[PDB]
Amino acid sequence: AEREAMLAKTAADNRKSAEQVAAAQADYEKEMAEARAQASALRDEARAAGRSVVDEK
Amino acid sequence: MSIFIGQLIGFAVIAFIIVKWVVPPVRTLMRNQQEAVRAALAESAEAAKK
C-alpha cells in the first residue's frame, strides 16, 4: 500500500511541479500585463487631464 | 555409507544445476525488482524535490 502511495505521490507531484512552473510563468506574465495596463490607464488619465486643462485655459 | 554417498552426489548434481541455471534467472529477477524499488523511492524523492 505504501509503494502504492509513493507511486501516487510521485505521479501527482511531478504533475504539480510542472503545473507550478507553468503557474509561475503565467502568473508573472499576467501580473506584468496588469501592471502595464494600469500604467497605460494612468498615462491615459494624465493625457485626459492635460487636454482638460488645455481646454480650460 | 554407500546410500549416503550416492544421495549426496545426487544432491550436489541438483545443487549445481540450480546454481548454474535456476539461480541466475531468479537472481536477475530479484535485482530487477530491487532496481525498481530503489528507483521508485528516488523518483518520489525527485518529484517532491522538484
Short mmCIF file of all heavy atoms in Angstrom, two decimals, unseen atoms left out:
data_model
loop_
_atom_site.label_atom_id
_atom_site.label_comp_id
_atom_site.label_asym_id
_atom_site.label_seq_id
_atom_site.Cartn_x
_atom_site.Cartn_y
_atom_site.Cartn_z
N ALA A 1 0.88 -1.14 0.00
CA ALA A 1 0.00 0.00 0.00
C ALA A 1 0.91 1.18 0.00
O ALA A 1 0.57 2.21 -0.54
N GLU A 2 2.07 1.02 0.61
CA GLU A 2 2.99 2.14 0.72
C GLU A 2 3.64 2.39 -0.59
O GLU A 2 3.82 3.51 -0.96
N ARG A 3 3.99 1.34 -1.31
CA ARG A 3 4.55 1.54 -2.61
C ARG A 3 3.48 2.20 -3.43
O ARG A 3 3.77 3.06 -4.23
N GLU A 4 2.24 1.80 -3.22
CA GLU A 4 1.14 2.36 -3.99
C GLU A 4 1.06 3.85 -3.78
O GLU A 4 0.96 4.63 -4.74
N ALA A 5 1.14 4.26 -2.52
CA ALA A 5 1.04 5.67 -2.18
C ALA A 5 2.24 6.44 -2.69
O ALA A 5 2.10 7.56 -3.09
N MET A 6 3.41 5.82 -2.67
CA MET A 6 4.58 6.50 -3.14
C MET A 6 4.38 6.75 -4.60
O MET A 6 4.68 7.81 -5.08
N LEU A 7 3.88 5.76 -5.31
CA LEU A 7 3.63 5.91 -6.72
C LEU A 7 2.69 7.06 -6.95
O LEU A 7 2.97 7.96 -7.75
N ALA A 8 1.60 7.08 -6.20
CA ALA A 8 0.63 8.16 -6.36
C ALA A 8 1.32 9.49 -6.20
O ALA A 8 1.20 10.35 -7.05
N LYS A 9 2.06 9.63 -5.12
CA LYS A 9 2.69 10.89 -4.86
C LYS A 9 3.57 11.24 -5.99
O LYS A 9 3.43 12.27 -6.54
N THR A 10 4.49 10.39 -6.38
CA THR A 10 5.43 10.79 -7.39
C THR A 10 4.61 11.30 -8.52
O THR A 10 4.75 12.45 -8.91
N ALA A 11 3.69 10.50 -9.02
CA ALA A 11 2.96 10.91 -10.20
C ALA A 11 2.36 12.29 -10.05
O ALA A 11 2.68 13.21 -10.80
N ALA A 12 1.50 12.45 -9.06
CA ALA A 12 0.81 13.72 -8.88
C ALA A 12 1.76 14.89 -8.73
O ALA A 12 1.59 15.91 -9.37
N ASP A 13 2.76 14.73 -7.89
CA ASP A 13 3.67 15.81 -7.61
C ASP A 13 4.43 16.20 -8.84
O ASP A 13 4.66 17.38 -9.05
N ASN A 14 4.84 15.26 -9.66
CA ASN A 14 5.61 15.68 -10.80
C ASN A 14 4.63 16.42 -11.66
O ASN A 14 4.99 17.37 -12.35
N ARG A 15 3.37 16.02 -11.62
CA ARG A 15 2.35 16.77 -12.34
C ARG A 15 2.20 18.17 -11.77
O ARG A 15 2.14 19.15 -12.52
N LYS A 16 2.18 18.29 -10.44
CA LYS A 16 2.05 19.59 -9.81
C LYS A 16 3.34 20.40 -9.91
O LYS A 16 3.27 21.63 -9.88
N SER A 17 4.50 19.76 -10.05
CA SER A 17 5.72 20.51 -10.31
C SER A 17 5.64 21.19 -11.66
O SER A 17 5.94 22.39 -11.80
N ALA A 18 5.22 20.45 -12.69
CA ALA A 18 5.01 21.06 -13.99
C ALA A 18 3.94 22.15 -13.92
O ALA A 18 4.10 23.24 -14.48
N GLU A 19 2.85 21.87 -13.20
CA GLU A 19 1.76 22.84 -13.09
C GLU A 19 2.23 24.11 -12.39
O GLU A 19 1.84 25.21 -12.76
N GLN A 20 3.08 23.97 -11.37
CA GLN A 20 3.54 25.13 -10.62
C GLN A 20 4.57 25.92 -11.40
O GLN A 20 4.61 27.15 -11.29
N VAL A 21 5.42 25.26 -12.19
CA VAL A 21 6.31 26.02 -13.07
C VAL A 21 5.50 26.81 -14.08
O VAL A 21 5.74 28.02 -14.30
N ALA A 22 4.51 26.17 -14.70
CA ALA A 22 3.64 26.87 -15.63
C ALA A 22 2.89 28.00 -14.94
O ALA A 22 2.70 29.07 -15.52
N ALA A 23 2.45 27.77 -13.70
CA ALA A 23 1.72 28.80 -12.96
C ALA A 23 2.62 29.97 -12.63
O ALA A 23 2.20 31.12 -12.71
N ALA A 24 3.87 29.70 -12.24
CA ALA A 24 4.81 30.79 -12.00
C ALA A 24 4.97 31.64 -13.25
O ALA A 24 4.84 32.87 -13.21
N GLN A 25 5.23 30.99 -14.39
CA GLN A 25 5.41 31.75 -15.63
C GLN A 25 4.15 32.53 -15.98
O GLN A 25 4.21 33.74 -16.28
N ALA A 26 2.99 31.88 -15.94
CA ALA A 26 1.74 32.51 -16.36
C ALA A 26 1.36 33.65 -15.42
O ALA A 26 0.88 34.69 -15.87
N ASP A 27 1.55 33.46 -14.12
CA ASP A 27 1.21 34.50 -13.16
C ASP A 27 2.16 35.68 -13.27
O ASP A 27 1.73 36.83 -13.16
N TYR A 28 3.45 35.43 -13.51
CA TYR A 28 4.36 36.53 -13.76
C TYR A 28 3.92 37.32 -14.98
O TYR A 28 3.85 38.55 -14.95
N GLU A 29 3.59 36.62 -16.07
CA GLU A 29 3.15 37.30 -17.28
C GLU A 29 1.86 38.08 -17.03
O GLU A 29 1.73 39.23 -17.47
N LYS A 30 0.90 37.48 -16.33
CA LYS A 30 -0.38 38.13 -16.11
C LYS A 30 -0.24 39.35 -15.21
O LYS A 30 -0.86 40.38 -15.46
N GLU A 31 0.56 39.24 -14.15
CA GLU A 31 0.75 40.39 -13.26
C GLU A 31 1.52 41.50 -13.96
O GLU A 31 1.23 42.68 -13.77
N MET A 32 2.52 41.14 -14.78
CA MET A 32 3.21 42.15 -15.56
C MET A 32 2.25 42.84 -16.51
O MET A 32 2.29 44.07 -16.67
N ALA A 33 1.37 42.07 -17.16
CA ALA A 33 0.40 42.66 -18.07
C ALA A 33 -0.56 43.57 -17.33
O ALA A 33 -0.94 44.63 -17.83
N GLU A 34 -0.99 43.17 -16.13
CA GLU A 34 -1.87 44.02 -15.33
C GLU A 34 -1.17 45.31 -14.95
O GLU A 34 -1.77 46.39 -14.98
N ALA A 35 0.11 45.23 -14.58
CA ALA A 35 0.87 46.43 -14.25
C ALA A 35 1.00 47.35 -15.46
O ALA A 35 0.85 48.57 -15.35
N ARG A 36 1.29 46.77 -16.63
CA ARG A 36 1.37 47.58 -17.85
C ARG A 36 0.03 48.23 -18.17
O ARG A 36 -0.02 49.39 -18.59
N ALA A 37 -1.06 47.49 -17.99
CA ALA A 37 -2.38 48.05 -18.26
C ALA A 37 -2.70 49.18 -17.30
O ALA A 37 -3.26 50.21 -17.70
N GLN A 38 -2.36 49.02 -16.02
CA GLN A 38 -2.56 50.10 -15.06
C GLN A 38 -1.72 51.31 -15.41
O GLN A 38 -2.18 52.45 -15.30
N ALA A 39 -0.47 51.09 -15.84
CA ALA A 39 0.37 52.21 -16.26
C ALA A 39 -0.22 52.93 -17.46
O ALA A 39 -0.22 54.16 -17.53
N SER A 40 -0.73 52.16 -18.43
CA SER A 40 -1.35 52.77 -19.60
C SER A 40 -2.59 53.56 -19.21
O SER A 40 -2.83 54.65 -19.74
N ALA A 41 -3.39 53.03 -18.28
CA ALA A 41 -4.55 53.77 -17.80
C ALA A 41 -4.14 55.06 -17.09
O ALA A 41 -4.79 56.09 -17.27
N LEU A 42 -3.08 55.01 -16.28
CA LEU A 42 -2.61 56.22 -15.61
C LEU A 42 -2.14 57.25 -16.62
O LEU A 42 -2.43 58.44 -16.48
N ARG A 43 -1.41 56.82 -17.65
CA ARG A 43 -0.94 57.76 -18.66
C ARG A 43 -2.09 58.32 -19.48
O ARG A 43 -2.09 59.49 -19.86
N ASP A 44 -3.10 57.49 -19.77
CA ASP A 44 -4.28 57.98 -20.46
C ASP A 44 -5.03 59.00 -19.62
O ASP A 44 -5.51 60.01 -20.14
N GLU A 45 -5.14 58.75 -18.31
CA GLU A 45 -5.76 59.73 -17.42
C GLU A 45 -4.95 61.01 -17.37
O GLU A 45 -5.51 62.11 -17.30
N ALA A 46 -3.62 60.89 -17.40
CA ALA A 46 -2.77 62.08 -17.42
C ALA A 46 -2.99 62.89 -18.69
O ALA A 46 -3.09 64.12 -18.64
N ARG A 47 -3.08 62.22 -19.84
CA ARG A 47 -3.35 62.93 -21.08
C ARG A 47 -4.74 63.54 -21.08
O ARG A 47 -4.94 64.64 -21.62
N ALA A 48 -5.72 62.85 -20.50
CA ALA A 48 -7.06 63.41 -20.39
C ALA A 48 -7.05 64.66 -19.53
O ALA A 48 -7.69 65.66 -19.86
N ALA A 49 -6.33 64.63 -18.41
CA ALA A 49 -6.22 65.81 -17.55
C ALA A 49 -5.51 66.94 -18.27
O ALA A 49 -5.88 68.11 -18.13
N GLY A 50 -4.47 66.61 -19.04
CA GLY A 50 -3.77 67.61 -19.82
C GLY A 50 -4.67 68.27 -20.85
O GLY A 50 -4.67 69.50 -20.98
N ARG A 51 -5.45 67.47 -21.57
CA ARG A 51 -6.39 68.03 -22.53
C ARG A 51 -7.46 68.85 -21.84
O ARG A 51 -7.87 69.90 -22.36
N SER A 52 -7.93 68.41 -20.67
CA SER A 52 -8.93 69.17 -19.94
C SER A 52 -8.38 70.52 -19.49
O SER A 52 -9.07 71.54 -19.61
N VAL A 53 -7.15 70.56 -18.98
CA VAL A 53 -6.58 71.83 -18.57
C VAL A 53 -6.30 72.71 -19.78
O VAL A 53 -6.45 73.93 -19.71
N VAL A 54 -5.90 72.12 -20.91
CA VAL A 54 -5.72 72.90 -22.13
C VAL A 54 -7.03 73.54 -22.54
O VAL A 54 -7.08 74.73 -22.88
N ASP A 55 -8.12 72.77 -22.52
CA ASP A 55 -9.42 73.32 -22.89
C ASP A 55 -9.87 74.38 -21.90
O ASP A 55 -10.47 75.39 -22.29
N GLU A 56 -9.61 74.17 -20.61
CA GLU A 56 -10.00 75.16 -19.61
C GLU A 56 -9.24 76.47 -19.80
O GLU A 56 -9.83 77.55 -19.73
N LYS A 57 -7.93 76.38 -20.06
CA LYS A 57 -7.16 77.59 -20.33
C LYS A 57 -7.61 78.25 -21.62
O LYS A 57 -7.65 79.47 -21.73
N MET B 1 26.72 -46.15 4.39
CA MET B 1 27.54 -45.04 3.83
C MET B 1 27.30 -44.91 2.33
O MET B 1 27.15 -43.80 1.81
N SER B 2 27.25 -46.04 1.63
CA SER B 2 27.09 -46.02 0.18
C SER B 2 25.83 -45.27 -0.22
O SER B 2 25.84 -44.45 -1.15
N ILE B 3 24.72 -45.53 0.48
CA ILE B 3 23.49 -44.80 0.22
C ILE B 3 23.71 -43.31 0.46
O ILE B 3 23.28 -42.46 -0.33
N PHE B 4 24.38 -42.97 1.56
CA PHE B 4 24.63 -41.57 1.87
C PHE B 4 25.49 -40.91 0.79
O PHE B 4 25.19 -39.80 0.36
N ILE B 5 26.55 -41.59 0.35
CA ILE B 5 27.42 -41.01 -0.68
C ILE B 5 26.64 -40.81 -1.97
O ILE B 5 26.77 -39.77 -2.64
N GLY B 6 25.84 -41.80 -2.36
CA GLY B 6 25.08 -41.68 -3.60
C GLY B 6 24.09 -40.53 -3.56
O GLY B 6 24.02 -39.71 -4.49
N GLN B 7 23.32 -40.43 -2.47
CA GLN B 7 22.35 -39.35 -2.38
C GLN B 7 23.03 -38.00 -2.24
O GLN B 7 22.51 -36.99 -2.71
N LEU B 8 24.21 -37.96 -1.61
CA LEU B 8 24.95 -36.71 -1.52
C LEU B 8 25.46 -36.26 -2.89
O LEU B 8 25.43 -35.07 -3.20
N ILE B 9 25.92 -37.20 -3.71
CA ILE B 9 26.34 -36.85 -5.06
C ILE B 9 25.15 -36.36 -5.87
O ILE B 9 25.25 -35.41 -6.65
N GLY B 10 24.00 -37.02 -5.72
CA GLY B 10 22.80 -36.54 -6.39
C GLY B 10 22.41 -35.14 -5.95
O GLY B 10 22.04 -34.29 -6.78
N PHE B 11 22.50 -34.87 -4.65
CA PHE B 11 22.20 -33.54 -4.14
C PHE B 11 23.18 -32.51 -4.70
O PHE B 11 22.79 -31.39 -5.04
N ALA B 12 24.46 -32.88 -4.80
CA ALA B 12 25.44 -31.98 -5.38
C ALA B 12 25.13 -31.69 -6.84
O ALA B 12 25.25 -30.54 -7.29
N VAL B 13 24.72 -32.71 -7.60
CA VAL B 13 24.39 -32.50 -9.01
C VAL B 13 23.20 -31.56 -9.14
O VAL B 13 23.23 -30.62 -9.95
N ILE B 14 22.15 -31.79 -8.36
CA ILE B 14 20.98 -30.91 -8.46
C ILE B 14 21.31 -29.51 -7.98
O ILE B 14 20.82 -28.52 -8.54
N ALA B 15 22.15 -29.38 -6.95
CA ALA B 15 22.56 -28.07 -6.47
C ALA B 15 23.32 -27.32 -7.55
O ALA B 15 23.09 -26.13 -7.78
N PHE B 16 24.23 -28.01 -8.24
CA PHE B 16 24.96 -27.39 -9.34
C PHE B 16 24.00 -26.96 -10.44
O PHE B 16 24.12 -25.87 -11.00
N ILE B 17 23.02 -27.82 -10.77
CA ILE B 17 22.07 -27.49 -11.82
C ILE B 17 21.32 -26.21 -11.47
O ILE B 17 21.21 -25.30 -12.29
N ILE B 18 20.80 -26.13 -10.25
CA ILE B 18 20.01 -24.97 -9.87
C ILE B 18 20.89 -23.73 -9.77
O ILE B 18 20.46 -22.62 -10.12
N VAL B 19 22.13 -23.89 -9.30
CA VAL B 19 23.01 -22.74 -9.14
C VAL B 19 23.46 -22.20 -10.49
O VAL B 19 23.71 -21.00 -10.63
N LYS B 20 23.57 -23.06 -11.50
CA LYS B 20 24.06 -22.64 -12.81
C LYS B 20 22.95 -22.27 -13.78
O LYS B 20 23.23 -21.58 -14.77
N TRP B 21 21.72 -22.71 -13.54
CA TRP B 21 20.62 -22.44 -14.46
C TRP B 21 19.37 -21.88 -13.80
O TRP B 21 18.61 -21.18 -14.48
N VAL B 22 19.12 -22.15 -12.52
CA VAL B 22 17.95 -21.63 -11.83
C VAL B 22 18.30 -20.41 -10.98
O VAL B 22 17.52 -19.47 -10.90
N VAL B 23 19.47 -20.42 -10.34
CA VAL B 23 19.90 -19.27 -9.55
C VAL B 23 20.09 -18.03 -10.42
O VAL B 23 19.68 -16.94 -9.99
N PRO B 24 20.70 -18.10 -11.59
CA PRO B 24 20.96 -16.87 -12.37
C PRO B 24 19.67 -16.13 -12.70
O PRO B 24 19.58 -14.92 -12.44
N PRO B 25 18.67 -16.78 -13.30
CA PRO B 25 17.44 -16.03 -13.63
C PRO B 25 16.71 -15.48 -12.41
O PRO B 25 16.25 -14.33 -12.44
N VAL B 26 16.58 -16.26 -11.37
CA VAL B 26 15.85 -15.80 -10.24
C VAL B 26 16.61 -14.67 -9.75
O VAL B 26 16.01 -13.72 -9.34
N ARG B 27 17.92 -14.72 -9.75
CA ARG B 27 18.68 -13.63 -9.17
C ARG B 27 18.41 -12.38 -9.94
O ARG B 27 18.31 -11.32 -9.38
N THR B 28 18.32 -12.50 -11.25
CA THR B 28 18.13 -11.32 -12.04
C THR B 28 16.86 -10.77 -11.56
O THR B 28 16.79 -9.68 -11.10
N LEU B 29 15.83 -11.56 -11.61
CA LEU B 29 14.52 -11.02 -11.23
C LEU B 29 14.60 -10.26 -9.92
O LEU B 29 14.02 -9.17 -9.78
N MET B 30 15.29 -10.81 -8.92
CA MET B 30 15.42 -10.09 -7.66
C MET B 30 16.14 -8.76 -7.85
O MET B 30 15.72 -7.73 -7.32
N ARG B 31 17.15 -8.71 -8.69
CA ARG B 31 17.88 -7.48 -8.80
C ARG B 31 17.01 -6.52 -9.52
O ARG B 31 16.88 -5.41 -9.10
N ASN B 32 16.31 -6.92 -10.57
CA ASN B 32 15.48 -6.02 -11.36
C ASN B 32 14.37 -5.48 -10.56
O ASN B 32 13.93 -4.38 -10.81
N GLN B 33 13.83 -6.28 -9.66
CA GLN B 33 12.81 -5.80 -8.75
C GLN B 33 13.38 -4.76 -7.79
O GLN B 33 12.75 -3.73 -7.52
N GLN B 34 14.58 -5.02 -7.26
CA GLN B 34 15.22 -4.05 -6.38
C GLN B 34 15.49 -2.74 -7.12
O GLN B 34 15.29 -1.65 -6.58
N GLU B 35 16.01 -2.88 -8.32
CA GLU B 35 16.22 -1.71 -9.11
C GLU B 35 14.94 -0.97 -8.96
O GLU B 35 14.93 0.13 -8.47
N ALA B 36 13.83 -1.60 -9.29
CA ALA B 36 12.56 -0.89 -9.26
C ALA B 36 12.28 -0.22 -7.94
O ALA B 36 11.91 0.92 -7.92
N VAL B 37 12.42 -0.93 -6.83
CA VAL B 37 12.06 -0.32 -5.56
C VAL B 37 12.89 0.93 -5.28
O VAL B 37 12.34 2.00 -4.93
N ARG B 38 14.20 0.82 -5.45
CA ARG B 38 15.09 1.95 -5.20
C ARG B 38 14.69 3.07 -6.11
O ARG B 38 14.60 4.20 -5.68
N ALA B 39 14.44 2.76 -7.36
CA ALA B 39 14.11 3.76 -8.34
C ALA B 39 12.88 4.50 -7.93
O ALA B 39 12.86 5.69 -8.03
N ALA B 40 11.85 3.80 -7.50
CA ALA B 40 10.59 4.43 -7.14
C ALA B 40 10.79 5.32 -5.96
O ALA B 40 10.27 6.43 -5.90
N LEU B 41 11.55 4.83 -4.99
CA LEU B 41 11.86 5.66 -3.85
C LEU B 41 12.50 6.96 -4.31
O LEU B 41 12.04 8.06 -3.95
N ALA B 42 13.53 6.86 -5.14
CA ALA B 42 14.27 8.04 -5.57
C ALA B 42 13.45 8.95 -6.44
O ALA B 42 13.74 10.13 -6.53
N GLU B 43 12.45 8.40 -7.11
CA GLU B 43 11.65 9.17 -8.02
C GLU B 43 10.69 9.94 -7.21
O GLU B 43 10.40 11.07 -7.53
N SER B 44 10.16 9.34 -6.17
CA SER B 44 9.30 10.11 -5.30
C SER B 44 10.15 11.21 -4.81
O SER B 44 9.73 12.36 -4.75
N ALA B 45 11.40 10.87 -4.49
CA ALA B 45 12.29 11.87 -3.95
C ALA B 45 12.36 13.05 -4.88
O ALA B 45 12.04 14.16 -4.48
N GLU B 46 12.69 12.81 -6.14
CA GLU B 46 12.89 13.89 -7.09
C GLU B 46 11.60 14.64 -7.39
O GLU B 46 11.62 15.83 -7.56
N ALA B 47 10.47 13.97 -7.40
CA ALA B 47 9.22 14.63 -7.67
C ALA B 47 8.92 15.59 -6.55
O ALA B 47 8.49 16.72 -6.79
N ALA B 48 9.13 15.16 -5.32
CA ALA B 48 8.90 16.04 -4.20
C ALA B 48 9.88 17.20 -4.23
O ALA B 48 9.51 18.34 -3.92
N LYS B 49 11.14 16.93 -4.59
CA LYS B 49 12.15 17.96 -4.57
C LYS B 49 11.83 18.93 -5.65
O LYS B 49 11.75 20.14 -5.42
N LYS B 50 11.60 18.40 -6.83
CA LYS B 50 11.22 19.26 -7.94
C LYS B 50 9.93 20.01 -7.65
O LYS B 50 9.76 21.14 -8.09
#
